[PDB]
């Protein structure tokens, strides 16, 4: 996965590959890069 700013996508048990950015200071669900 090629992230926008380079921020991490992780598999949570909820069944979501989440995107969180320390530059964004926020937790977003789906790939922002799409």
């Amino acid at each position: 996965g090629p992230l926008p700013d380079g921020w991490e996508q992780a598999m949570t048990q909820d069944g979501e590959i989440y995107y969180i950015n320390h530059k964004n200071k926020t937790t977003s669900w789906l790939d922002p890069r799409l």
Binding site: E8, A10, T12, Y18, I20, K25, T26, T27, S28, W29
Partner: peptide
């Protein structure tokens, strides 16, 4: 819905 809070990132 809300995902996990603003957090440093998880792998397992």
């Amino acid at each position: 819905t809300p995902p996990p809070a603003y957090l440093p990132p998880e792998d397992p």
